[PDB]
RNA sequence: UUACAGGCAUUUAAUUCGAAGCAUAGCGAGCUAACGUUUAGCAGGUUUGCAUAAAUUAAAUAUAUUAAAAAAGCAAGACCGCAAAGGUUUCUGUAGCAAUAGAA
RNA sequence: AAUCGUACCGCAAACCAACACAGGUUAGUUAUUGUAAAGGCUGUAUAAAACCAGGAUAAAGGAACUCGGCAAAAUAGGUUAUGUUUUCGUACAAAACCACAACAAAAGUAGUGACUGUUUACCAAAAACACAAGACUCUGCUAACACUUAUAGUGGAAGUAUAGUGUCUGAUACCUGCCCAAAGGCAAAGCAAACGGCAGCUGUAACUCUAACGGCUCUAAGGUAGCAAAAUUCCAUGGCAUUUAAAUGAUGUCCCGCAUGAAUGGUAUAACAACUUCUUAACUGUCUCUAUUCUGGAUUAGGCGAACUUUAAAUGCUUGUGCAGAUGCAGGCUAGCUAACAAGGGACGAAGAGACCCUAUGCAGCUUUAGGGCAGGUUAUUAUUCAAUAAACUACCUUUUUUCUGGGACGGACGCUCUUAUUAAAGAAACAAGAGUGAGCAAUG
RNA sequence: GCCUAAAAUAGCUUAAUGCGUUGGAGUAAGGGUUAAAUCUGUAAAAACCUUGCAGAAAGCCUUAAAGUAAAAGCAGCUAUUCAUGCCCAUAAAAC
RNA sequence: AAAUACAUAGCUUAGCGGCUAAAGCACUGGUUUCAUAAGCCAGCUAUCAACAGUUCGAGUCUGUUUGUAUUUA
RNA sequence: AAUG
């Protein structure tokens, strides 16, 4: 069968799996945020907007 | 043992012999609840609860009981195995119902305490109880089927069921369809009781039991005619060990049964014992199933070590 | 199954529920608002026309 | 003997590039496998085992009964089949329309 | 009565596939007897090559094609008196009769699985798995067992031996024989529907042949019934019969069968099968043997505009030669120039540092009565009111498993002496040849 | 009114026997044959006194069957259901 | 063709360095019986595939030529 | 104590 369609977008799934509230809920996620602050990435999470 | 002559005869009452119209109906034998007077509708609202299916998964989310899940919606009934609440009050049987979670039948009983509203309860139906019968418990009750009394007031030879190991916890021992237990003798503070499996055990005299047997005598005449019949009940297929590959089971290799039969974790399963040799409960067991004395089981590897 | 809640338990918990009461005015009409002691959400329950202040309805 | 320049040797990533792999920590079940809760879908036909009513409708009208698709139901891992889900055989295509498709 | 959504695309040129991608994408509604309301959409310029693709028609023959009726064609549908087989519900044959326009496709024989189902996303859909059902064994409830650091907690199950866990057989019918010695495992000193096994020699009946019947050796026991040229047979295309003008085929039958055999089941079995095998009817461009023709591409013209590949090139044949098959070296020949359309002999043609084989300081996964360990459970011993030690069983961790060799494997060999050929100095190799030895003696000093 | 080796149904009794049965005491055999052996024991059997559990069968009465239960068959005790048989007293004008 | 075993009165079967021999069936003679079988008693087979070696002495230990199984190509 |  044709492959290459492994991404099926879903807004609710994206926020629950990779959101800021999720990253701040565990020690390992908090360490991930610090690593991205140290490298100086402009956007920290897929969930961020102004 | 099922035979095709049994279905052809169509003799035993209370069974539905499905005519062999299709391949999936040729060997099907079921129970006719209407002919027996057993209610097969929804349970009482105040004595039932709807719960999700677990499919043999624990709080860690991993499968611990294999070959489960994928059936119909599950509803549970609350059953009062100990009738100590209603000791003096007589009860009137309203209906005899069928429960897919057990092999016996349940009875709906209404009590009318003086100065209070009616009370409804579920009980394990004795062998010969129908709608309209009266059930009584506690001191001052006759020795008849459906009566619950302490072991100090039951004759030796009377079959009993729903026996309590502990004085007030509730009946736990004899519950399956068409099973019973008997009392052989009564000592100072214990009675010698023979269990359905053939074991002789000591039980405190202050425990309670119900006179009679369980209320389903057609359990062993059932034949599921299809694979899907047990799928609807919540059972999934299983694969033989010798059919798997080496990394899955000890029998995985191409050859069949290279080593003695065992569990998936390597334990011999054709006679090896699993009860603890030093189990604290050995003080209450006199003879195990098959006639083995308790001392023979308790002291078996100690002699070999010596 | 070690965790089951039967209808008798549901009714006992319902009867043992505590609330915090607050009077509010809307369009000149008085309403009673309540908050469950174990939650942070307020809701408008009833109006003074159907409730008698000072009792336990 | 001490210092300096050179050749050779020893040790430290030590002439340059290249594995399959081994160990520790984190990120993945929006694909797929099994399962949970909630929701929805499957034209039109055919064969078969059962099912009678607040008082089924007529005649008998006692007695004995009789006739009627008189049933807005259940059952089948049932059959021919539009959708739908598949992928049996053939041919086409082969950096292709497509890193697995098209027609029958 | 506040707050957020309201444009546009949404079977698609706007979403998921790197693309304006023949692929993927949920629900709700609408016209239509033999038809079909609303609404929506739209292609550079020609034609009288070969060849390719998708269709149509075809004289006479009708499987002669081919590994194989692959593909294509075909009255395909309904009702039947009678007969056969059944697990009694089914299933099959059948002269004939009945059809407005549309829709249309067999039966029998053998082998294997009962059946409907499930499977290697991307070369295997099956005889493999599952299945209803049979048997064996474990488990007295704080059950056995599984997850977990477990002292927790949870599943089993809120079930209770007519119940639950594990294992092997696999509907149904008729059946299912002997062995627990040795080496293990388990157990109540016993257990085979646990893991496994189930012989050989020799004499004998009127003529012959054969052996009904005897003798001997050994073992825990010596294969019973059934079936049998098999999905199992080396001699082999075994012998006989049916089938054809012609039979390594198919069916039936004969049978100690290299190496069949009874729950890793034996023998049968109605129905069912996009399974494998053979046959009958009909049908046909499969074929004798092809021909014509329609649609699209190729081919001609304008516009737009890729890719594999490339040491350098001005790049003939033939025999000889050579790292042993020459466009390029030697002899004999070859003289208008550049391309287009078409075919595919050669350029040891292009694509992917051969998968086969052998060689490594190799790597990985799996197995076990190869070595070592104890770090979970069970078991044994001891001690305090969830502990310590271990030549056991299960689980787990870690380590080892030469070289030579007319390729490797299989076989053989590896120390040390004497002798034979390569002459009469010494030395000199092959998995060349012919013989010894891993001691003896208290005297044989 | 009574009786029944008649049939069906339901309760009850135990002489003897068996044992992977309890405790006491005790020590080499037990069992079997024409004659032997296999087998069961000395790691404590059989025999003796006691404990527990279990199935089948019915000594004397007891004899034919003389009941004949239609034939097949039938006797441990008690009761129910039902069918016979005995005494005593009755009954039928048409079958 | 490689590799592991074996060739013993008429037939099964001891023996594997001190002489060249054991046991059972068969064969022969006697006894029992009206006679034949069974049963009893006494006897008999130089008892050692073929050739060349080792050793005082070999069926016995080492090689070759034959025959028979078993495994491999 | 099998047979004729
Ligand atoms: K299975
Ligand atoms: K295996
Ligand atoms: K189906
Ligand atoms: K097996
Ligand atoms: K198939
Ligand atoms: K070419
Ligand atoms: K060679
Ligand atoms: Mg496999
Ligand atoms: Mg169907
Ligand atoms: Mg169908
Ligand atoms: Mg699939
Ligand atoms: Mg033609
Ligand atoms: Mg042909
Ligand atoms: Mg199948
Ligand atoms: Mg199918
Ligand atoms: Mg595939
Ligand atoms: Mg299939
Ligand atoms: Mg396929
Ligand atoms: Mg079966
Ligand atoms: Mg087999
Ligand atoms: Mg089978
Ligand atoms: Mg063109
Ligand atoms: Mg040449
Ligand atoms: Mg040339
Ligand atoms: Mg290479
Ligand atoms: Mg080598
Ligand atoms: Mg004779």
Numbering used by the authors:
A (entry chain AB): 114 to 163
B (entry chain Aa): 57 to 362
C (entry chain Xc): 37 to 93
Paper lines:
Ribosomes consist of the small subunit (SSU) that selects aminoacyl-tRNAs cognate to mRNA codons, and the large subunit (LSU) that contains the peptidyl transferase centre and polypeptide exit tunnel. Both subunits are composed of a catalytic rRNA core and scaffolding proteins. Mitoribosomes of green algae display a great structural divergence from their tracheophyte relatives, with fragmentation of both rRNA and proteins as a defining feature. Here, we report a 2.9 Å resolution structure of the mitoribosome from the alga Polytomella magna harbouring a reduced rRNA split into 13 fragments.
Further data processing and classification revealed distinct classical and hybrid tRNA binding states, supporting the engagement in active translation. All bacterial protein homologues are conserved with the exception of the universally lost bS20, and the functional sites for mRNA and tRNA binding remain largely unaltered. In addition to fragmentation of the rRNA, we also noted three occurrences of protein fragmentation in the conserved bacterial homologues uS3m, uS4m and uS7m, each one of which is split into two nuclear-encoded fragments. We found that the rRNA contains a non-canonical reduced form of the 5S, as well as a permutation of the LSU domain I. The mt-5S rRNA is stabilised by mL40 that is also found in mitoribosomes lacking the 5S, which suggests an evolutionary pathway. Finally, in the exit tunnel, mL128 constricts the tunnel width of the vestibular area, and mL105, a homolog of a membrane targeting component mediates contacts with an inner membrane bound insertase.
